[PDB]
Structures are given as C-alpha cells and as structure tokens.
mmCIF file with all atom_site columns, all heavy atoms in Angstrom:
data_model
loop_
_atom_site.group_PDB
_atom_site.id
_atom_site.type_symbol
_atom_site.label_atom_id
_atom_site.label_alt_id
_atom_site.label_comp_id
_atom_site.label_asym_id
_atom_site.label_entity_id
_atom_site.label_seq_id
_atom_site.pdbx_PDB_ins_code
_atom_site.Cartn_x
_atom_site.Cartn_y
_atom_site.Cartn_z
_atom_site.occupancy
_atom_site.B_iso_or_equiv
_atom_site.pdbx_formal_charge
_atom_site.auth_seq_id
_atom_site.auth_comp_id
_atom_site.auth_asym_id
_atom_site.auth_atom_id
_atom_site.pdbx_PDB_model_num
ATOM 1   N N   . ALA A 1 1  ? -12.782 -10.148 5.201  1.00 43.20 ? 1  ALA A N   1
ATOM 2   C CA  . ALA A 1 1  ? -11.356 -9.869  5.094  1.00 43.20 ? 1  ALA A CA  1
ATOM 3   C C   . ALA A 1 1  ? -10.798 -9.178  3.796  1.00 43.20 ? 1  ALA A C   1
ATOM 4   O O   . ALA A 1 1  ? -11.287 -9.348  2.690  1.00 43.20 ? 1  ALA A O   1
ATOM 5   C CB  . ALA A 1 1  ? -10.646 -11.141 5.341  1.00 43.20 ? 1  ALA A CB  1
ATOM 6   N N   . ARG A 1 2  ? -9.724  -8.507  4.056  1.00 43.14 ? 2  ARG A N   1
ATOM 7   C CA  . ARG A 1 2  ? -9.097  -7.599  3.086  1.00 43.14 ? 2  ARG A CA  1
ATOM 8   C C   . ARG A 1 2  ? -8.493  -8.324  1.830  1.00 43.14 ? 2  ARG A C   1
ATOM 9   O O   . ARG A 1 2  ? -8.666  -7.799  0.737  1.00 43.14 ? 2  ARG A O   1
ATOM 10  C CB  . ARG A 1 2  ? -7.828  -6.960  3.773  1.00 43.14 ? 2  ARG A CB  1
ATOM 11  C CG  . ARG A 1 2  ? -8.379  -6.012  4.813  1.00 43.14 ? 2  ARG A CG  1
ATOM 12  C CD  . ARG A 1 2  ? -7.333  -4.995  5.222  1.00 43.14 ? 2  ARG A CD  1
ATOM 13  N NE  . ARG A 1 2  ? -7.821  -3.884  6.129  1.00 43.14 ? 2  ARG A NE  1
ATOM 14  C CZ  . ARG A 1 2  ? -7.110  -3.027  6.886  1.00 43.14 ? 2  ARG A CZ  1
ATOM 15  N NH1 . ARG A 1 2  ? -5.740  -2.889  6.832  1.00 43.14 ? 2  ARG A NH1 1
ATOM 16  N NH2 . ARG A 1 2  ? -7.853  -2.300  7.701  1.00 43.14 ? 2  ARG A NH2 1
ATOM 17  N N   . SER A 1 3  ? -8.130  -9.604  1.945  1.00 45.58 ? 3  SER A N   1
ATOM 18  C CA  . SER A 1 3  ? -7.830  -10.658 0.909  1.00 45.58 ? 3  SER A CA  1
ATOM 19  C C   . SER A 1 3  ? -6.696  -10.103 0.037  1.00 45.58 ? 3  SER A C   1
ATOM 20  O O   . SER A 1 3  ? -6.743  -10.110 -1.187 1.00 45.58 ? 3  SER A O   1
ATOM 21  C CB  . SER A 1 3  ? -9.048  -11.072 0.200  1.00 45.58 ? 3  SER A CB  1
ATOM 22  O OG  . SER A 1 3  ? -8.754  -12.062 -0.733 1.00 45.58 ? 3  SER A OG  1
ATOM 23  N N   . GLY A 1 4  ? -5.682  -9.501  0.725  1.00 40.61 ? 4  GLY A N   1
ATOM 24  C CA  . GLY A 1 4  ? -5.003  -8.351  0.156  1.00 40.61 ? 4  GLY A CA  1
ATOM 25  C C   . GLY A 1 4  ? -4.192  -8.732  -1.119 1.00 40.61 ? 4  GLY A C   1
ATOM 26  O O   . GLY A 1 4  ? -4.403  -8.233  -2.208 1.00 40.61 ? 4  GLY A O   1
ATOM 27  N N   . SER A 1 5  ? -3.299  -9.784  -1.099 1.00 40.51 ? 5  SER A N   1
ATOM 28  C CA  . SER A 1 5  ? -2.466  -10.249 -2.269 1.00 40.51 ? 5  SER A CA  1
ATOM 29  C C   . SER A 1 5  ? -2.320  -11.736 -2.100 1.00 40.51 ? 5  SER A C   1
ATOM 30  O O   . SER A 1 5  ? -2.087  -12.304 -1.061 1.00 40.51 ? 5  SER A O   1
ATOM 31  C CB  . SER A 1 5  ? -1.085  -9.493  -2.255 1.00 40.51 ? 5  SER A CB  1
ATOM 32  O OG  . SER A 1 5  ? -0.427  -9.581  -3.439 1.00 40.51 ? 5  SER A OG  1
ATOM 33  N N   . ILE A 1 6  ? -2.111  -12.398 -3.224 1.00 40.01 ? 6  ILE A N   1
ATOM 34  C CA  . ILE A 1 6  ? -1.926  -13.890 -3.330 1.00 40.01 ? 6  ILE A CA  1
ATOM 35  C C   . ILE A 1 6  ? -0.458  -14.300 -3.030 1.00 40.01 ? 6  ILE A C   1
ATOM 36  O O   . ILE A 1 6  ? -0.059  -15.465 -3.079 1.00 40.01 ? 6  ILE A O   1
ATOM 37  C CB  . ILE A 1 6  ? -2.425  -14.261 -4.771 1.00 40.01 ? 6  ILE A CB  1
ATOM 38  C CG1 . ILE A 1 6  ? -2.875  -15.737 -4.847 1.00 40.01 ? 6  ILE A CG1 1
ATOM 39  C CG2 . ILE A 1 6  ? -1.340  -13.854 -5.840 1.00 40.01 ? 6  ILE A CG2 1
ATOM 40  C CD1 . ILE A 1 6  ? -3.626  -16.001 -6.144 1.00 40.01 ? 6  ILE A CD1 1
ATOM 41  N N   . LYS A 1 7  ? 0.379   -13.254 -2.772 1.00 39.76 ? 7  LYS A N   1
ATOM 42  C CA  . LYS A 1 7  ? 1.841   -13.327 -2.458 1.00 39.76 ? 7  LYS A CA  1
ATOM 43  C C   . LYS A 1 7  ? 2.063   -12.763 -1.043 1.00 39.76 ? 7  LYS A C   1
ATOM 44  O O   . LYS A 1 7  ? 3.206   -12.842 -0.575 1.00 39.76 ? 7  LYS A O   1
ATOM 45  C CB  . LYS A 1 7  ? 2.665   -12.771 -3.628 1.00 39.76 ? 7  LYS A CB  1
ATOM 46  C CG  . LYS A 1 7  ? 2.256   -11.400 -4.068 1.00 39.76 ? 7  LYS A CG  1
ATOM 47  C CD  . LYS A 1 7  ? 3.254   -10.886 -5.089 1.00 39.76 ? 7  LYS A CD  1
ATOM 48  C CE  . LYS A 1 7  ? 2.973   -9.442  -5.455 1.00 39.76 ? 7  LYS A CE  1
ATOM 49  N NZ  . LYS A 1 7  ? 3.920   -9.043  -6.473 1.00 39.76 ? 7  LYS A NZ  1
ATOM 50  N N   . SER A 1 8  ? 1.024   -12.127 -0.408 1.00 42.37 ? 8  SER A N   1
ATOM 51  C CA  . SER A 1 8  ? 1.079   -11.614 1.005  1.00 42.37 ? 8  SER A CA  1
ATOM 52  C C   . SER A 1 8  ? 1.583   -12.787 1.917  1.00 42.37 ? 8  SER A C   1
ATOM 53  O O   . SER A 1 8  ? 1.274   -13.947 1.653  1.00 42.37 ? 8  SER A O   1
ATOM 54  C CB  . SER A 1 8  ? -0.347  -11.201 1.339  1.00 42.37 ? 8  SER A CB  1
ATOM 55  O OG  . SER A 1 8  ? -0.281  -10.406 2.527  1.00 42.37 ? 8  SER A OG  1
ATOM 56  N N   . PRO A 1 9  ? 2.483   -12.531 2.850  1.00 41.25 ? 9  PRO A N   1
ATOM 57  C CA  . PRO A 1 9  ? 3.134   -13.561 3.653  1.00 41.25 ? 9  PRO A CA  1
ATOM 58  C C   . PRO A 1 9  ? 2.196   -14.537 4.403  1.00 41.25 ? 9  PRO A C   1
ATOM 59  O O   . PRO A 1 9  ? 2.543   -15.673 4.620  1.00 41.25 ? 9  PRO A O   1
ATOM 60  C CB  . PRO A 1 9  ? 4.059   -12.814 4.699  1.00 41.25 ? 9  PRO A CB  1
ATOM 61  C CG  . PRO A 1 9  ? 3.506   -11.342 4.725  1.00 41.25 ? 9  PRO A CG  1
ATOM 62  C CD  . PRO A 1 9  ? 2.774   -11.170 3.412  1.00 41.25 ? 9  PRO A CD  1
ATOM 63  N N   . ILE A 1 10 ? 1.064   -14.073 4.860  1.00 41.11 ? 10 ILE A N   1
ATOM 64  C CA  . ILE A 1 10 ? 0.006   -14.786 5.589  1.00 41.11 ? 10 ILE A CA  1
ATOM 65  C C   . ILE A 1 10 ? -0.817  -15.748 4.711  1.00 41.11 ? 10 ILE A C   1
ATOM 66  O O   . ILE A 1 10 ? -1.589  -16.535 5.235  1.00 41.11 ? 10 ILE A O   1
ATOM 67  C CB  . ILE A 1 10 ? -1.010  -13.759 6.158  1.00 41.11 ? 10 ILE A CB  1
ATOM 68  C CG1 . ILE A 1 10 ? -1.594  -12.823 5.067  1.00 41.11 ? 10 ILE A CG1 1
ATOM 69  C CG2 . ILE A 1 10 ? -0.275  -12.971 7.227  1.00 41.11 ? 10 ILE A CG2 1
ATOM 70  C CD1 . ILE A 1 10 ? -2.781  -11.977 5.510  1.00 41.11 ? 10 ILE A CD1 1
ATOM 71  N N   . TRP A 1 11 ? -0.737  -15.620 3.376  1.00 39.92 ? 11 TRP A N   1
ATOM 72  C CA  . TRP A 1 11 ? -1.404  -16.393 2.327  1.00 39.92 ? 11 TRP A CA  1
ATOM 73  C C   . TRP A 1 11 ? -1.086  -17.871 2.264  1.00 39.92 ? 11 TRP A C   1
ATOM 74  O O   . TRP A 1 11 ? -0.542  -18.346 1.264  1.00 39.92 ? 11 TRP A O   1
ATOM 75  C CB  . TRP A 1 11 ? -1.309  -15.584 1.036  1.00 39.92 ? 11 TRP A CB  1
ATOM 76  C CG  . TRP A 1 11 ? -2.250  -16.087 -0.042 1.00 39.92 ? 11 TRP A CG  1
ATOM 77  C CD1 . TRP A 1 11 ? -1.979  -17.130 -0.855 1.00 39.92 ? 11 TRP A CD1 1
ATOM 78  C CD2 . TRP A 1 11 ? -3.667  -15.705 -0.245 1.00 39.92 ? 11 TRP A CD2 1
ATOM 79  N NE1 . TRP A 1 11 ? -3.127  -17.270 -1.687 1.00 39.92 ? 11 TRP A NE1 1
ATOM 80  C CE2 . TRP A 1 11 ? -4.228  -16.536 -1.232 1.00 39.92 ? 11 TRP A CE2 1
ATOM 81  C CE3 . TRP A 1 11 ? -4.504  -14.677 0.251  1.00 39.92 ? 11 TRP A CE3 1
ATOM 82  C CZ2 . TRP A 1 11 ? -5.508  -16.396 -1.701 1.00 39.92 ? 11 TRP A CZ2 1
ATOM 83  C CZ3 . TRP A 1 11 ? -5.854  -14.720 -0.035 1.00 39.92 ? 11 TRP A CZ3 1
ATOM 84  C CH2 . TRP A 1 11 ? -6.361  -15.599 -0.993 1.00 39.92 ? 11 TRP A CH2 1
ATOM 85  N N   . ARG A 1 12 ? -1.441  -18.651 3.302  1.00 41.32 ? 12 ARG A N   1
ATOM 86  C CA  . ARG A 1 12 ? -1.151  -20.109 3.543  1.00 41.32 ? 12 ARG A CA  1
ATOM 87  C C   . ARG A 1 12 ? 0.316   -20.579 3.539  1.00 41.32 ? 12 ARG A C   1
ATOM 88  O O   . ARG A 1 12 ? 0.783   -20.909 4.640  1.00 41.32 ? 12 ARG A O   1
ATOM 89  C CB  . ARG A 1 12 ? -2.044  -21.017 2.696  1.00 41.32 ? 12 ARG A CB  1
ATOM 90  C CG  . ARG A 1 12 ? -2.312  -22.414 3.260  1.00 41.32 ? 12 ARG A CG  1
ATOM 91  C CD  . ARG A 1 12 ? -1.347  -23.543 2.930  1.00 41.32 ? 12 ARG A CD  1
ATOM 92  N NE  . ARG A 1 12 ? -2.080  -24.778 3.260  1.00 41.32 ? 12 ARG A NE  1
ATOM 93  C CZ  . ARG A 1 12 ? -1.569  -25.962 2.986  1.00 41.32 ? 12 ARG A CZ  1
ATOM 94  N NH1 . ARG A 1 12 ? -0.678  -26.222 2.001  1.00 41.32 ? 12 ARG A NH1 1
ATOM 95  N NH2 . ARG A 1 12 ? -2.075  -27.021 3.658  1.00 41.32 ? 12 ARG A NH2 1
ATOM 96  N N   . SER A 1 13 ? 0.860   -20.612 2.315  1.00 41.23 ? 13 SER A N   1
ATOM 97  C CA  . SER A 1 13 ? 2.185   -21.012 2.016  1.00 41.23 ? 13 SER A CA  1
ATOM 98  C C   . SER A 1 13 ? 2.778   -20.348 0.713  1.00 41.23 ? 13 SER A C   1
ATOM 99  O O   . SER A 1 13 ? 2.182   -19.759 -0.188 1.00 41.23 ? 13 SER A O   1
ATOM 100 C CB  . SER A 1 13 ? 2.236   -22.500 1.880  1.00 41.23 ? 13 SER A CB  1
ATOM 101 O OG  . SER A 1 13 ? 1.260   -22.976 1.032  1.00 41.23 ? 13 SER A OG  1
ATOM 102 N N   . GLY A 1 14 ? 4.078   -20.399 0.714  1.00 41.50 ? 14 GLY A N   1
ATOM 103 C CA  . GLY A 1 14 ? 4.895   -19.858 -0.415 1.00 41.50 ? 14 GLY A CA  1
ATOM 104 C C   . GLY A 1 14 ? 5.830   -18.797 0.041  1.00 41.50 ? 14 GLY A C   1
ATOM 105 O O   . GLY A 1 14 ? 6.674   -18.324 -0.730 1.00 41.50 ? 14 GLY A O   1
ATOM 106 N N   . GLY A 1 15 ? 5.814   -18.436 1.355  1.00 38.20 ? 15 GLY A N   1
ATOM 107 C CA  . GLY A 1 15 ? 6.701   -17.338 1.797  1.00 38.20 ? 15 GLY A CA  1
ATOM 108 C C   . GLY A 1 15 ? 6.188   -16.626 2.992  1.00 38.20 ? 15 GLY A C   1
ATOM 109 O O   . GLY A 1 15 ? 5.020   -16.216 3.034  1.00 38.20 ? 15 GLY A O   1
ATOM 110 N N   . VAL A 1 16 ? 7.029   -16.402 4.051  1.00 34.15 ? 16 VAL A N   1
ATOM 111 C CA  . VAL A 1 16 ? 6.550   -15.777 5.317  1.00 34.15 ? 16 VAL A CA  1
ATOM 112 C C   . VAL A 1 16 ? 7.395   -14.487 5.509  1.00 34.15 ? 16 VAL A C   1
ATOM 113 O O   . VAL A 1 16 ? 8.443   -14.307 4.851  1.00 34.15 ? 16 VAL A O   1
ATOM 114 C CB  . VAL A 1 16 ? 6.578   -16.692 6.574  1.00 34.15 ? 16 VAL A CB  1
ATOM 115 C CG1 . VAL A 1 16 ? 5.516   -17.786 6.368  1.00 34.15 ? 16 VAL A CG1 1
ATOM 116 C CG2 . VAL A 1 16 ? 8.015   -17.267 6.843  1.00 34.15 ? 16 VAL A CG2 1
ATOM 117 N N   . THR A 1 17 ? 6.980   -13.606 6.460  1.00 32.75 ? 17 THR A N   1
ATOM 118 C CA  . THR A 1 17 ? 7.268   -12.162 6.284  1.00 32.75 ? 17 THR A CA  1
ATOM 119 C C   . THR A 1 17 ? 8.738   -11.773 6.605  1.00 32.75 ? 17 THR A C   1
ATOM 120 O O   . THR A 1 17 ? 9.154   -10.925 5.816  1.00 32.75 ? 17 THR A O   1
ATOM 121 C CB  . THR A 1 17 ? 6.217   -11.350 7.088  1.00 32.75 ? 17 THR A CB  1
ATOM 122 O OG1 . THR A 1 17 ? 6.376   -9.983  6.587  1.00 32.75 ? 17 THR A OG1 1
ATOM 123 C CG2 . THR A 1 17 ? 6.416   -11.299 8.561  1.00 32.75 ? 17 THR A CG2 1
ATOM 124 N N   . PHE A 1 18 ? 9.450   -12.442 7.536  1.00 34.22 ? 18 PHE A N   1
ATOM 125 C CA  . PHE A 1 18 ? 10.789  -12.056 7.866  1.00 34.22 ? 18 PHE A CA  1
ATOM 126 C C   . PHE A 1 18 ? 11.766  -13.269 7.572  1.00 34.22 ? 18 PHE A C   1
ATOM 127 O O   . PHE A 1 18 ? 12.889  -13.145 8.026  1.00 34.22 ? 18 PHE A O   1
ATOM 128 C CB  . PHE A 1 18 ? 10.959  -11.540 9.339  1.00 34.22 ? 18 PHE A CB  1
ATOM 129 C CG  . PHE A 1 18 ? 10.326  -10.274 9.771  1.00 34.22 ? 18 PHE A CG  1
ATOM 130 C CD1 . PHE A 1 18 ? 10.296  -9.916  11.106 1.00 34.22 ? 18 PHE A CD1 1
ATOM 131 C CD2 . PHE A 1 18 ? 9.928   -9.252  8.855  1.00 34.22 ? 18 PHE A CD2 1
ATOM 132 C CE1 . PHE A 1 18 ? 9.786   -8.599  11.493 1.00 34.22 ? 18 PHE A CE1 1
ATOM 133 C CE2 . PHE A 1 18 ? 9.517   -7.967  9.259  1.00 34.22 ? 18 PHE A CE2 1
ATOM 134 C CZ  . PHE A 1 18 ? 9.502   -7.622  10.605 1.00 34.22 ? 18 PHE A CZ  1
ATOM 135 N N   . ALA A 1 19 ? 11.339  -14.343 6.810  1.00 35.29 ? 19 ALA A N   1
ATOM 136 C CA  . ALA A 1 19 ? 12.123  -15.589 6.591  1.00 35.29 ? 19 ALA A CA  1
ATOM 137 C C   . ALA A 1 19 ? 13.566  -15.307 6.141  1.00 35.29 ? 19 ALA A C   1
ATOM 138 O O   . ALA A 1 19 ? 13.775  -14.270 5.532  1.00 35.29 ? 19 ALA A O   1
ATOM 139 C CB  . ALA A 1 19 ? 11.406  -16.421 5.501  1.00 35.29 ? 19 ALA A CB  1
ATOM 140 N N   . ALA A 1 20 ? 14.511  -16.233 6.398  1.00 35.16 ? 20 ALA A N   1
ATOM 141 C CA  . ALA A 1 20 ? 15.946  -15.930 6.485  1.00 35.16 ? 20 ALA A CA  1
ATOM 142 C C   . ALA A 1 20 ? 16.618  -15.454 5.198  1.00 35.16 ? 20 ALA A C   1
ATOM 143 O O   . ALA A 1 20 ? 16.235  -15.887 4.075  1.00 35.16 ? 20 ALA A O   1
ATOM 144 C CB  . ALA A 1 20 ? 16.619  -17.141 7.123  1.00 35.16 ? 20 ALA A CB  1
ATOM 145 N N   . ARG A 1 21 ? 17.579  -14.574 5.450  1.00 34.52 ? 21 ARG A N   1
ATOM 146 C CA  . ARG A 1 21 ? 18.456  -13.908 4.413  1.00 34.52 ? 21 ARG A CA  1
ATOM 147 C C   . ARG A 1 21 ? 19.815  -14.462 4.672  1.00 34.52 ? 21 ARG A C   1
ATOM 148 O O   . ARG A 1 21 ? 20.035  -15.157 5.699  1.00 34.52 ? 21 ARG A O   1
ATOM 149 C CB  . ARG A 1 21 ? 18.340  -12.362 4.588  1.00 34.52 ? 21 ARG A CB  1
ATOM 150 C CG  . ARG A 1 21 ? 17.080  -11.815 3.882  1.00 34.52 ? 21 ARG A CG  1
ATOM 151 C CD  . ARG A 1 21 ? 15.732  -12.226 4.560  1.00 34.52 ? 21 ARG A CD  1
ATOM 152 N NE  . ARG A 1 21 ? 15.673  -11.764 5.954  1.00 34.52 ? 21 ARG A NE  1
ATOM 153 C CZ  . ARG A 1 21 ? 14.787  -10.854 6.369  1.00 34.52 ? 21 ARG A CZ  1
ATOM 154 N NH1 . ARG A 1 21 ? 13.748  -10.405 5.640  1.00 34.52 ? 21 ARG A NH1 1
ATOM 155 N NH2 . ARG A 1 21 ? 14.907  -10.412 7.597  1.00 34.52 ? 21 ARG A NH2 1
ATOM 156 N N   . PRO A 1 22 ? 20.753  -14.303 3.718  1.00 35.17 ? 22 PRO A N   1
ATOM 157 C CA  . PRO A 1 22 ? 22.129  -14.808 3.915  1.00 35.17 ? 22 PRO A CA  1
ATOM 158 C C   . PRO A 1 22 ? 22.792  -14.053 5.069  1.00 35.17 ? 22 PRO A C   1
ATOM 159 O O   . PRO A 1 22 ? 22.728  -12.821 5.052  1.00 35.17 ? 22 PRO A O   1
ATOM 160 C CB  . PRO A 1 22 ? 22.850  -14.475 2.587  1.00 35.17 ? 22 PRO A CB  1
ATOM 161 C CG  . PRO A 1 22 ? 21.837  -14.307 1.490  1.00 35.17 ? 22 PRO A CG  1
ATOM 162 C CD  . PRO A 1 22 ? 20.633  -13.788 2.322  1.00 35.17 ? 22 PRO A CD  1
ATOM 163 N N   . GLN A 1 23 ? 23.358  -14.872 5.994  1.00 38.74 ? 23 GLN A N   1
ATOM 164 C CA  . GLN A 1 23 ? 23.938  -14.457 7.261  1.00 38.74 ? 23 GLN A CA  1
ATOM 165 C C   . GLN A 1 23 ? 25.464  -14.544 7.231  1.00 38.74 ? 23 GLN A C   1
ATOM 166 O O   . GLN A 1 23 ? 25.920  -15.657 6.818  1.00 38.74 ? 23 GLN A O   1
ATOM 167 C CB  . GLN A 1 23 ? 23.517  -15.380 8.426  1.00 38.74 ? 23 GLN A CB  1
ATOM 168 C CG  . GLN A 1 23 ? 22.100  -15.622 8.652  1.00 38.74 ? 23 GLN A CG  1
ATOM 169 C CD  . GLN A 1 23 ? 21.178  -14.585 9.320  1.00 38.74 ? 23 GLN A CD  1
ATOM 170 O OE1 . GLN A 1 23 ? 20.406  -14.012 8.571  1.00 38.74 ? 23 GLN A OE1 1
ATOM 171 N NE2 . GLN A 1 23 ? 21.318  -14.321 10.597 1.00 38.74 ? 23 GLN A NE2 1
ATOM 172 N N   . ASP A 1 24 ? 26.195  -13.473 7.544  1.00 39.51 ? 24 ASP A N   1
ATOM 173 C CA  . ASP A 1 24 ? 27.579  -13.508 7.849  1.00 39.51 ? 24 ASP A CA  1
ATOM 174 C C   . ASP A 1 24 ? 27.964  -12.787 9.121  1.00 39.51 ? 24 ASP A C   1
ATOM 175 O O   . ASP A 1 24 ? 27.976  -11.539 9.100  1.00 39.51 ? 24 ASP A O   1
ATOM 176 C CB  . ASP A 1 24 ? 28.439  -13.081 6.684  1.00 39.51 ? 24 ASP A CB  1
ATOM 177 C CG  . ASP A 1 24 ? 29.965  -13.309 6.830  1.00 39.51 ? 24 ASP A CG  1
ATOM 178 O OD1 . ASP A 1 24 ? 30.336  -14.528 6.873  1.00 39.51 ? 24 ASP A OD1 1
ATOM 179 O OD2 . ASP A 1 24 ? 30.658  -12.268 7.059  1.00 39.51 ? 24 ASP A OD2 1
ATOM 180 N N   . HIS A 1 25 ? 28.368  -13.539 10.146 1.00 39.92 ? 25 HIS A N   1
ATOM 181 C CA  . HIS A 1 25 ? 28.616  -12.976 11.464 1.00 39.92 ? 25 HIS A CA  1
ATOM 182 C C   . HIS A 1 25 ? 30.068  -12.703 11.816 1.00 39.92 ? 25 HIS A C   1
ATOM 183 O O   . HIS A 1 25 ? 30.257  -12.132 12.895 1.00 39.92 ? 25 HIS A O   1
ATOM 184 C CB  . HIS A 1 25 ? 27.897  -13.863 12.463 1.00 39.92 ? 25 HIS A CB  1
ATOM 185 C CG  . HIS A 1 25 ? 26.450  -14.186 12.239 1.00 39.92 ? 25 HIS A CG  1
ATOM 186 N ND1 . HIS A 1 25 ? 25.305  -13.515 12.765 1.00 39.92 ? 25 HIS A ND1 1
ATOM 187 C CD2 . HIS A 1 25 ? 26.079  -15.279 11.559 1.00 39.92 ? 25 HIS A CD2 1
ATOM 188 C CE1 . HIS A 1 25 ? 24.314  -14.268 12.331 1.00 39.92 ? 25 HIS A CE1 1
ATOM 189 N NE2 . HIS A 1 25 ? 24.724  -15.367 11.623 1.00 39.92 ? 25 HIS A NE2 1
#
C-alpha cells in the first residue's frame, strides 16, 4: 500500500474525508 499521509482521512482515526462543516439552511 501507498501509505500516503498520516493525516489522510482513511488513516484509522483523527478525521474523515467529508465530515461536517457549519450548516445554515
């Protein structure tokens, strides 16, 4: 595997790729 970054979203935990932003509807 490409082992790409230690901050890449797939990297166990600490942040996922589209996780929520402030919402105003």
Side-chain angles (χ1 to χ4, degrees):
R2 289 199 173 164
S3 181
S5 196
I6 204 168
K7 53 172 186 183
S8 194
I10 55 169
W11 195 278
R12 207 272 197 174
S13 50
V16 292
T17 194
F18 293 170
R21 278 70 59 115
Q23 307 283 106
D24 190 66
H25 309 266

